[PDB]
Amino acid sequence: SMEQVAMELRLTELTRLLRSVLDQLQDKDPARIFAQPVSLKEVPDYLDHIKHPMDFATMRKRLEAQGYKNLHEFEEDFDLIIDNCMKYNARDTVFYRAAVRLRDQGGVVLRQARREVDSIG
């Protein structure tokens, strides 16, 4: 149907905007701490601690399959990256501190993304 096409075009355009958001957030992680999944070879107990692991590569795979239907879904995954790190790692660690800085910096980006998503529809 034409309606299904129009819906698909909106999803495609959302995907464009989320790719630009994703790039901007990942620039706020210049150490590449959150770039890839935590390795279960190197952290064999991880899944005993963290039930829903997340990282920027995993988000990028979902994004490229047009797997985020709305900004809320995308933000959920970004928040997992931060929140998982802040639980597994202690306050005095480079990992935790990196997550705090990513959260603070990413907030700004996400605030305007929400306005754009609402504005353009």
Swiss-Prot record:
Known tissue expression = Highly expressed in testis.
Which parts of the sequence belong to the Bromo domain? 9-113
The subcellular location is:
Nucleus; Chromosome
What domain of life? Eukaryota
Point out the cross-link Glycyl lysine isopeptide (Lys-Gly) (interchain with G-Cter in SUMO2) in this chain.
41
Could you describe the subunit structure of this protein? Component of some HBO1 complex composed of KAT7/HBO1, MEAF6, ING4 and BRD1/BRPF2. Component of the MOZ/MORF complex composed at least of ING5, KAT6A, KAT6B, MEAF6 and one of BRPF1, BRD1/BRPF2 and BRPF3. Interacts (via PHD-type zinc finger domain) with unmodified histone H3. Interacts (via PWWP domain) with dimethylated and trimethylated 'Lys-79' on histone H3.
Q: What does this protein do?
A: Scaffold subunit of various histone acetyltransferase (HAT) complexes, such as the MOZ/MORF and HBO1 complexes, that acts as a regulator of hematopoiesis. Plays a key role in HBO1 complex by directing KAT7/HBO1 specificity towards histone H3 'Lys-14' acetylation (H3K14ac), thereby promoting erythroid differentiation.
Name the record gives this protein? Bromodomain-containing protein 1
| Gene that this polypeptide is encoded by | BRD1
